[PDB]
Amino acid sequence: PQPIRGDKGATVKIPRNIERDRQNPDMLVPPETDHGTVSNMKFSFSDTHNRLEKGGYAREVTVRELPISENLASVNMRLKPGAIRELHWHKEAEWAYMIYGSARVTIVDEKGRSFIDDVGEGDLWYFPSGLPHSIQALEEGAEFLLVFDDGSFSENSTFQLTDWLAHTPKEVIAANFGVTKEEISNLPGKEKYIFENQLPGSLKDDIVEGPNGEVPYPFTYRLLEQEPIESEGGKVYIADSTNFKVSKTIASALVTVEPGAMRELHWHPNTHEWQYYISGKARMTVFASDGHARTFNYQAGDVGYVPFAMGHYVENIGDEPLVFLEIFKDDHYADVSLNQWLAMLPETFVQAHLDLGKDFTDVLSKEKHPVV
Amino acid sequence: PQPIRGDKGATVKIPRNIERDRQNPDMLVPPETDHGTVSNMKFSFSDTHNRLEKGGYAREVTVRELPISENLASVNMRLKPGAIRELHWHKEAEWAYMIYGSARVTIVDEKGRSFIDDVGEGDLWYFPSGLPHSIQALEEGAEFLLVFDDGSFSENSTFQLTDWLAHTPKEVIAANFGVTKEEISNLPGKEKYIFENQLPGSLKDDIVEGPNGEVPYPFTYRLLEQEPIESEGGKVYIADSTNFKVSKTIASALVTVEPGAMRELHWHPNTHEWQYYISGKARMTVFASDGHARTFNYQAGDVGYVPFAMGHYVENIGDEPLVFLEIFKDDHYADVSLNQWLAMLPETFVQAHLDLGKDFTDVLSKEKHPVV
Amino acid sequence: PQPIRGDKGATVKIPRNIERDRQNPDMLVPPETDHGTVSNMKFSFSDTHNRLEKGGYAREVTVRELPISENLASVNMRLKPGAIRELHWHKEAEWAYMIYGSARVTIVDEKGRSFIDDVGEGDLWYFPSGLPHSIQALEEGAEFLLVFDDGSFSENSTFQLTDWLAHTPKEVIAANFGVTKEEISNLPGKEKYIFENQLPGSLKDDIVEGPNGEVPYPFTYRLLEQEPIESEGGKVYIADSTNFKVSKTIASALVTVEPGAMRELHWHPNTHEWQYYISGKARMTVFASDGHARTFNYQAGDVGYVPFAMGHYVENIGDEPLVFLEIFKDDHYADVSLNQWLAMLPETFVQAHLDLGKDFTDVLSKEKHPVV
Amino acid sequence: PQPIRGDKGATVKIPRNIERDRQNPDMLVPPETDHGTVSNMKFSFSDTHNRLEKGGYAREVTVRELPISENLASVNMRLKPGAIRELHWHKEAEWAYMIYGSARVTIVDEKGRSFIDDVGEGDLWYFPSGLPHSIQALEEGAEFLLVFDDGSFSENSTFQLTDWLAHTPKEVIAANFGVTKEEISNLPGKEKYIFENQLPGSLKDDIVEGPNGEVPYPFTYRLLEQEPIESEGGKVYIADSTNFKVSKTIASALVTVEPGAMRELHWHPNTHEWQYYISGKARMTVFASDGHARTFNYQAGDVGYVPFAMGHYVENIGDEPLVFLEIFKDDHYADVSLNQWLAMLPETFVQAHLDLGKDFTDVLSKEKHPVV
Amino acid sequence: PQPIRGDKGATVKIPRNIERDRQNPDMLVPPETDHGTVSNMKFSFSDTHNRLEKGGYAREVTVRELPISENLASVNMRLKPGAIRELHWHKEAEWAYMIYGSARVTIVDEKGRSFIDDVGEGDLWYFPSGLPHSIQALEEGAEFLLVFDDGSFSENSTFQLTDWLAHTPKEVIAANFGVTKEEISNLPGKEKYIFENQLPGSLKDDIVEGPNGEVPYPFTYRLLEQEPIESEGGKVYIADSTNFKVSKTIASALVTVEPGAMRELHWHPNTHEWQYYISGKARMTVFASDGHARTFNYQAGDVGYVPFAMGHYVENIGDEPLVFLEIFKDDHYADVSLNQWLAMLPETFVQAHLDLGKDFTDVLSKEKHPVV
């Protein structure tokens, strides 16, 4: 491939990364309509350090990797069968999508109520900031995407149970529980983070009963069970605080785009959009106002971003289905469709703007079709 | 005029701007009670660049002009008869007051519901952040004041319909609507922003029906229709989220002060006050605490500002009525009257503070009179 | 005392402050488990400038003294019998705890409604931001702790009644009230702030009736009247917006820890904790995640702080009861108990984490006991 | 005047400030070539609060008035005959230009060396940061422009001699000088700032001799004595650290533009330009790159600004001479002339850029002519 | 490849980017010694938008792509034979390395002196901030790396000649040069940026003579002509202000590492290191102190970064030579070699630190060998 478009551009003369150029066709050779300075809106998990542990791994994309995403950060975590992500808590709220396998999660709220449940492929969970939780993969192991509502998410964001105890005077721990220092002499000297463990038993056998009762709302959500918004070119599954009650700071949508289809031109009137590409290949042009626009390519891993109110679309440029997540730090999902917008205005008024005739306004639809 | 007060000050000896000195009597010669460093709280639209277009003009006062106003910015827009302010949207919420003429506005919400209505002198509109809208002046043309809830409002805040399409690949636009590239070959190459157009027909003929139903609440408000708070020296018309339902981030008040009257000494316990002087001449002293106070003069255009909780009053120093707007970035209007405050406390307690007698406390009123 | 722990440390060889070293046993000789850089979380009112006035005094601990506390600041105020803290208002909300004596407070809201009441030892008050108020000590005088919801609280935060009038043109004041300049010639030339005054009469005689009616909710709260959460080692009295209705930005808890007891290991899932030590002596280790932890000593005065979500405990290390306040800038109090958390999880799962057996999990309690 | 240019713009329909519109012809009706968002680069001293004292006055334009000027602030000070600007010092360096009258200044350096001298119209002075100084007007009184090298210049920037003593324990002052508290009982209770005083005697009689010798370099500079750069349309007098040795942080140029002339198109490769218009009327277009440019009008007072490297010119649009100051926070003056730049490049290369022929390149001059 | 190291890690179960994983062996499977949160220190030009023009292209890596690099930004520019990078200037200083081909550059300083010269492969140029310049490729075309001393480098950083004129009133341009508006009617309406042009003639024929004389120092430097520091595993060519006189804000080093060799363990005691990989493949571990370290992989394009004082090395992990640039925003190059450091200390002292014997200290060298 060469950076040539018509009579513009030229061949690359210096040593280059041909493999990456092939993955970014629309960046090596952008649309003629691209223009102006626009921040980077793409980053691959494959370009991050992978923390390997006995029991799995974890890699992250944060504001230190993708500066534009100051409000959201993400971790791609993998657990082997039975492996446990140590009991912990953080300052940020946590949202997750199970891509592969399954796992059992636990969480106890500020009123001493516990919630334990199994999560499979296509399911989500949301843990409010500060509430302690854990994850343990089941027989197939597990690999999921975590999203935290602070782009600065880092090592100083998470508190591990064993790390806390390892840094608390033995005499204080003893006094706190009413035991002797000798009885807790075997406590770990360092945190575990992720550790191998035998597979757990049936969920029903793990349920713990308490004097505080059951939690008011579930911390897990079966996203694929609900009926999706079905368009001619694909489908959209949405989960925000209106249906997944506890998810107050994260609204999400799983979008599937068939080959030859595209997520239509639209924008979000509420907040920034954070994206994760599960599978497939795509291209998206972000319109940043005042004649500024830049096109980006995305595939598999890849994290994407669309700043608040910027116009965009997501086109499948591959032969396989395109599947990605749209994440928003808000209590609801909201979007404005270009097609629907114009369809709901007087025909001659739209014609006056576009210098087009009735032949164009005749194709506008008053019904919203997310994927065409 | 000379900067002389009693035995203080002196005549100006260097070349000067006599015209401006005449407009700022209380700045050239401030009250003896003024003291300390206080930020500038005044700026004139006449001191800004006027963007002229075929169909009208627009000038703005932002944080780049008035640094103290970081949360609110304003645009003075003028449209000729039939002229259209191109379909667009922005990150900020928009509030407006029609000073002269009338116009038809359109807006479509995130659920595909449209609202179209005509706005006349004394009417307002409020467009939630991110929702697309337009303005088209009627037979008398129109001139209004726009207020956006972010002082950094600029060119990167607004997204124009034709600018978006002009910066989107033709093949993508074609695919989005299901037409050929040839059918959209006549789309504008650049945005229009403001453009001349034939006057529209009757409002009833423009109303568009849709499968999503009518909007829950109107985006326009007839401010002058309601009964105002009538005081001995003037009247106050208030519009906040309690009566103009959709206006959640902007609370407003239209104040009219007759000659020889004044908006009484008061402060706002909720947020900063942004002002626009429609007509007349005035002076206001802002009390910034810790013995700091500065007096400013205002007239016609002029934008004013009163930081959160600072004490102030607005005195008419002219022969004609004084008319101005008080704007607040909040979901409600709130103020504390000095008179009412003292009137609601034990008489001897107030006397103990002011070193004054019953003769003074006897004039205090338990009823609030905004303009005396 | 010497900074020696086992074979670590050494004797101090340079001139030193032995008195302070004696007050900070756990800082001169920290637990072996302390580690890493942790910001200072302690400051004494005795290390601040005391503003002395005719009628009392006031000293403060703000972000300029304790940098970690950016959201909360405090003032220790003392009033002699009958002394008045001048009518004033500020940008910040104000919360208070009467430690000694009693006082009468007044406050008028934005609707012209007044609230006057007497506050005794153990009582609280909360004045919403911007609402004018006053304090006048009764026959025993008064000494209380004030907490403002902005760590930057300073001189530019408070507006005094007489200071406002002293910096307002006489002709404007006259016009505002409808009197002559001669009638207000005796107004103070400078603010009073705190001034001596004769003791007031009975509360019932001070109550002012108005055309706006009574306030919807009281601005004072009798904290010690309610039944506290009683544990084996002490008690906790909580006051947040769920019971003390008007206190929307401040949640509080008065904790009493008997000798030999401790506020258990816990953390707050909602926000930072600000502390004030009323009496006694203690030590607290703050766990800041990622193997970081630091221990601090506190006594009498002393202000403490625990950043959001950090693990902590408060142990009484003296022979007398330990009494302190836990303050949070939020509309509710919330905490997660380490004991309760583990008690509500499957036993073998906890055992897998701690490398401990049934003997340990058997002591866990599903009921929360704040002080053990 | 009306905001109309050809077929663009329209008449103003709302109440307006006709006087200011007349002063800003190029802002009400900007050049067709103006475009994009550009910060405000103009502010009038007449729009500022004038501090009046017994002996003169002072008004300032700081970053609180003109946000773009973060590195430089200015004060317009006026002193009556014999009046003294109290002995003081500040954190910022101070540069000055005597516009009217004359004054005697004093300054003592960190080595105890004193410098006393008289300054007349056209003379300058530069006081390094932190060095104490004073100003006393002579028989004609004085009015000058002060420039400080920090845009945040305010009340907290200046330390007055009597204010320091007024806030130092009497016993400490006594001990410091070896006198009794009784001997200093008459010290002022408050600062003087500016105060009336009898005219001083001859300069030679005020010169103080010391054991530390004379200062290495003078703190005053006779700008108009040197030969200026004389062009066909005016002249330029430059004073920077290369000729006015002590002026290390301020470089200056006094520019005079005859009617029908203009300061040529140029830019500064070193730093931002701060301007003060002494007399006349002008217009300047600032080119901010990327197709952004805005035109401003200036007259008498007025402060102007040109951010670092932006292209500009200053055209006299009046019938009288245009006189202004160009100030730079740097140790040298530097500029690049558009004409000279192109004149020093191959002719065909310039022709290739401008699409113009030899007829144009033939008029280019290799010699720099600041004012044409 | 799989993220597995011994008994740590696991196979990837979700869709992935195998191509990128293959390019980042040490990121997918980091050294066991890596630990802690470390910012991203790598970015590929292939992952950026390529601006294509008639005559070449340009792509950039700025702080918007690589957040850690706040002080330096870079552009990879390509010019076809004879193509011109339009006459322009910027706020930032510019440094360049010619990787392929050759070009003629022009620059005029603030004294009207011009410098024109040809630059070939291995040559550099440095243009001080604000000084106008141009680049025109010769018969082979050209491709080079530009480095600007501000990470925020963007569109608002560069001023183009034709863009300035296009946004300046025609009447002003006419007056500035003494021509009629008609004579300049053919000036471009928009900037050119990069445009095709006929190849220039011999350099000697382009040299322009002026009344200001020759520039004091050359703006170009033949880096490969000088004798490099030759080590056993490679060579280092250094150019800083001590030899390339005008390059005051950029110090550089071209490093060549043979297969099986490595840039030794070292750190820089002066400032941050910015890197560009010309050819080959490598891996570098950055030691960030306090037990934090992260390994990164680099190849062809790729930009790297090493924050101030962090320890590092650069190992060739390929079969071909590794060639990269080390750039520093400082007036000199400086480094501390771990080997040399220990070699210059008492043997037993080093042994006491490392718990190693004479066998190790015996291999230390007092001479610095950059590449081993």
Ligand SMILES: [Mg+2]
């Ligand atoms: Mg464009």
Ligand SMILES: [Mg+2]
């Ligand atoms: Mg005062």
Ligand SMILES: [Mg+2]
């Ligand atoms: Mg440790």
Ligand SMILES: [Mg+2]
């Ligand atoms: Mg333009």
Ligand SMILES: [Mg+2]
């Ligand atoms: Mg380690």
Ligand SMILES: [Mn+2]
């Ligand atoms: Mn988690």
Ligand SMILES: [Mn+2]
């Ligand atoms: Mn979207």
Ligand SMILES: [Mn+2]
């Ligand atoms: Mn709008």
Ligand SMILES: [Mn+2]
């Ligand atoms: Mn008000």
Ligand SMILES: [Mn+2]
């Ligand atoms: Mn208070």
Ligand SMILES: [Mn+2]
């Ligand atoms: Mn706590």
Ligand SMILES: [Mn+2]
């Ligand atoms: Mn001074």
Ligand SMILES: [Mn+2]
């Ligand atoms: Mn200039």
Ligand SMILES: [Mn+2]
């Ligand atoms: Mn350049």
Ligand SMILES: [Mn+2]
């Ligand atoms: Mn290095």
